[PDB]
Amino acid sequence: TVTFDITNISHKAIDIILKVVLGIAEHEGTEVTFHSERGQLQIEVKNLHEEDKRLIEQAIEAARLADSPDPESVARAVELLTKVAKASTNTELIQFIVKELLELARKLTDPKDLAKVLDSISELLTELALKTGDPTAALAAMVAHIAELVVRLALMAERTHPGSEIVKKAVKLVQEVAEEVLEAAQLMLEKPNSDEVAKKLEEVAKKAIEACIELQQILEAWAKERGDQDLLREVREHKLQILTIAVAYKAAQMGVTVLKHTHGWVVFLVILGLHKQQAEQLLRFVHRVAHALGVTLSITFSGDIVVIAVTVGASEEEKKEVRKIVKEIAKQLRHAETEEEAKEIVQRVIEEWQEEG
Amino acid sequence: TVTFDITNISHKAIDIILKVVLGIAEHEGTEVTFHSERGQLQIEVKNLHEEDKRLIEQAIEAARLADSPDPESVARAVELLTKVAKASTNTELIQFIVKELLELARKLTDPKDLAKVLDSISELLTELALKTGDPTAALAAMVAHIAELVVRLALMAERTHPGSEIVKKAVKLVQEVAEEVLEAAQLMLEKPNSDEVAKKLEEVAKKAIEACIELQQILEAWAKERGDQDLLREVREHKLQILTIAVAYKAAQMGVTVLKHTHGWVVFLVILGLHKQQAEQLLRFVHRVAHALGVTLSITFSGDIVVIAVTVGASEEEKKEVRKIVKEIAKQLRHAETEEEAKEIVQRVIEEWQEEG
Amino acid sequence: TVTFDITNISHKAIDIILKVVLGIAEHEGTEVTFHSERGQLQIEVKNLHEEDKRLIEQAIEAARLADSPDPESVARAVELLTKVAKASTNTELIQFIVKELLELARKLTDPKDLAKVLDSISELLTELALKTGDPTAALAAMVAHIAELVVRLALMAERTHPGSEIVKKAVKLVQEVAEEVLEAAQLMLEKPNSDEVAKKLEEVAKKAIEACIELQQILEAWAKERGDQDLLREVREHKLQILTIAVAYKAAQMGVTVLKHTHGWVVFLVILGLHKQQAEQLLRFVHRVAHALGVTLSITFSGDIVVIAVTVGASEEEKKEVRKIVKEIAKQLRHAETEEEAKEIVQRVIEEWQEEG
Amino acid sequence: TVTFDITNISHKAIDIILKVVLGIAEHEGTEVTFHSERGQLQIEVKNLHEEDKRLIEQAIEAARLADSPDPESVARAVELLTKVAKASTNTELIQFIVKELLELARKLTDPKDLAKVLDSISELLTELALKTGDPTAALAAMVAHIAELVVRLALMAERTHPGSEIVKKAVKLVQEVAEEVLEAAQLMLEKPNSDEVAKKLEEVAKKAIEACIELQQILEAWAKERGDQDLLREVREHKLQILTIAVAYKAAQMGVTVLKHTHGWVVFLVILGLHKQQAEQLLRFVHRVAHALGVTLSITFSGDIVVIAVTVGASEEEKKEVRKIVKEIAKQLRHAETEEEAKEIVQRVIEEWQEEG
């Protein structure tokens, strides 16, 4: 017989523990006893397996921290609730954790800690994708990578800024996007497999990309005021990654396959199996986002194939090589049927050229 | 032949009398006849006997009372209309009686009349259970019993207090409960065998439990001022009863079987046939209500079987024997298949216990 | 051929003329040929009836009157439009006439023309009965007849009263009832056999009966102050008539057969086939109206058959004659199984009463 | 290969170009290449035809002009986008062109540039009729012809007395009518082959007819204040054409055949096969419109044939000939079955009559 002890604990925290304990006991098909003394709580269980024991202890630790006002205790609680969700077989428990997490996010005000919680939200969405098996949650995993890029930009802001009303605007936008994301995470569990989830997720993705563009402008302005060409290089490399995942998101909303590569001052994407309407909507989204980012493009289209090359500033003598590569990719892709060929073709084009990169 | 009169009466009182006369006359089916006058009535039906005549007399007495301001006349009227309902072959006469009660309740409030009103409402809900066969009326009977026990607390308030703003607040709360119950009674007649009755009755049970907790605190606070250990004993026994009925009510909303026992300082419940979601709701309801009441719980779970027991104020030495007994009750219950065996098993634990007590 | 001139009346009036003139083609798929310019019109037809020419003449005269302020010209026009409607094979022309009647009524203010208008509205509702073939229109015909008897009372008021704010209230009430009746006449053509027609007609009847009661009380109060016992006898007989018709209306809305007789200071009704619910509502309606009128009822129920009789001002001796007659009519009608036999039985009792009246 | 250049333009103008280039690549599916930065764009396409190259060039010229505030550049842009739409394989390109037309019209405040836009709207409605085959678009082509007569009226206002507060009122009316036409075009674009488009078009036609009547008042009042018999002739001869189109428009809501002819001071129409239930709507609409225009109509009908003759006025000795002609045409039309007969019948009557024409 295993036994657990819980003290100074709220009704809210007891609700989590009862959901967990009864959920685990129903999974095990086993007997449970609960005792209370003057509002303290004790729990006893038969034939329990060790990770389920550890999960009850971890839920207990999480709930004991969740009653706190302390933001470090919030970050650790969110990490533990994330571990509980990452183990979870139970949908109502995931729903209740998502609802607790929305409140735990709303507790935070400061970017240094909000980074920890956004990383945890990425893990939450990662598990939610594995739980649902749904391309609508693969979009949420791409939005999580956009948020992870927002966290990397936030860490750059911590590395550089003294604090200002621009940082207050930034953390408000980030916190608001975090709330918009967790509202979509709730909606995905309240209406699984529905078009309204994709509509909300597109409004989320739009809002996130616009926030990213503003964060890039903030960091670029700070880099231009200080003359920091090295920070501007790091940010430039992140611009390419942001557009990469943004393109991945739009392609995934259409449900088409994507392959991608990086080499210093140039980044490449190949997209396969497109059609007229999707291709136009994508190319519109690409050109609008790229124009807002201020990044130099080369693109080519052949109905189902789309090739996108995204570039940092370079000489025209360097841009000639990108112009060559784009036409060379469009030559070499022309007879393939499967992504394992396409990967080898792109690698072959690289192996036929890379000395000039 | 039967003949009756009025000195003066309202048109609504005439409508009740006419509905009663038409009903009692038509019941003979194959031959019926009667006549009226501005202030008189006569019936010519062959087959009618004493109780048919007495029902018209009782309706006429109720009608003569119904126009009055007098609350004693109200209490007598609701009793008479309850006697009419208890005989009634038809629910639309009961709809008229409920519409009258929805007016009659509002006129005034005092604990002694309020008690007889809520008790008569319990009787009307009892007849409504027999007319409908719908367990929402049995649920409402448990709620009305809870309310009636609350008016026994109000009679103890008359036993102990000269009256105050807090007592007038309590009177408003119980008057709201009486209104909310009567609204539920009218709704149940409009929408039998539906979920909206269960939702309204849950909002009644919520308000009722909160009013119970409030009144129990009002009396407990006076008992803690005046040192009244005997009033604490009565209030503790009533607390335990209210919780016992409330747990039975919540289990009856799930439609499961309940068995009950009582020994003063310790009180026992067994519940049979619970689903996963039913248990996960029930045990949280039990916890929140018990922790609001301040009572000392024991709970254990075995899938579809749940055992609950409750105590107050037992020594840390006496608590051991209760917790032993609770674990033993579960150990005894494991092999059972029918309700008579469970009754005999719990009785056997009691019949083995009472030699040592 | 036929040829005519409009002498520069409004184009609104031409709308009616064109509707009528083209309407001539409906009779046989009729070979109408036509010419017009600048308010002069000419027609030729194969086998033209004199009635076609009279309908053209009637439409012309009605159109010529329709621009006028004058109430007598409106009363003449309403009669002509009624005379058109009473020939009409076309229902849209009747809808157009109803749309004009709404405005024609609201223009008018004065008793004699208002009487001819409401009388004509009864004729228009009579034609609506002949067009619909439905007893729903007979309900309106009884209500319109009641209103017409109300304007006969208003003519007795004009014959006697000095004019007052009470008369201005009376005119306003009759105007409202007229517009409510005409709204029901429009609704009968827009939504035939809808439940909304039965709802609107019942509201019209309810409102009209309350206006009847009010006007009957207004005239009775003035006739009491003037001292005219003979005018009070007429008014009381007109009360009894309107009550009699109102009972017939309510029973006809229930869909059941009614038979009627009038015999000076006492009036009689028989109704065949009332359900319990119908008998209950009819008894409520009868009682409420009777107390609002101040009349002495007598009623008996014998299965689905109901007998009603009414009086005022009977001596303590003549009250015995009513009780005798009512008991006897019931006693003989208890063996009655057909309409002509029941008519003969009621006649036989009343013919035998010539030695007692 | 086609290769083309784009100096600085709006992202809307880029969106149009991409919609066009991809919307052309629709046909052959051949490869496309793009290069860009935040102020410049360049495009290249392979295995593409001369007419496709012209469409690309025309879209390029349209995009280059579309950002401009200049009214002449707006007129040319709508003309070019129309010239693209007039060949289009792609429905969404028409949708986008019309959507930007809404704003391109709202930008204009010049009567002659708005006239080129209204002319282009007639062409776009012509293409929309050729795309849909919908009689609701043929109705709109008649509304566009009314708008051409509005344009001709506006050009006569410029020819005579521009710039007054009365002309500013006219400009507001024409701009409102243009907006109402364009919003009706958007509704037809969103929901082809549905009754709500015809109900919207009726509001447009109503406003257009009222605007035409007002423009006729404006010109005729000035013409009377100059004594200008030739301007009175030109305007009155356009009144005939306005009524001619208005008749055809209303008849096209039934979808019936219409034939029309002109000879100096008189204009004639014939309408074939009207069912009575429709004829009663049409004849009334015609007579209402004619009375508002103030023109001396002669209207005739016989069975299902309607003959309309419009006159500006002459002596009774001239009016006799129109009366004779209308009667004779009605006699002559009796036996025909097809429009090639009817044209020749009317032409034969006119060619026999023109000795007094």
XYZ file of C-alpha atoms in Angstrom, chain A residues 22 26 30-36, chain B residues 280 296-303:
18
model
C -9.153 8.874 -9.303
C -9.462 3.999 -12.734
C -7.738 -0.448 -8.053
C -9.072 0.548 -4.578
C -8.473 4.010 -2.947
C -8.894 5.492 0.546
C -9.053 9.209 1.389
C -8.742 10.621 4.933
C -8.995 14.207 6.209
C -15.100 12.130 -10.007
C -14.487 15.126 9.541
C -14.762 12.711 6.580
C -13.874 9.141 5.734
C -14.130 8.056 2.047
C -13.106 4.930 0.117
C -13.574 3.868 -3.511
C -13.696 0.513 -5.388
C -14.848 1.540 -8.899
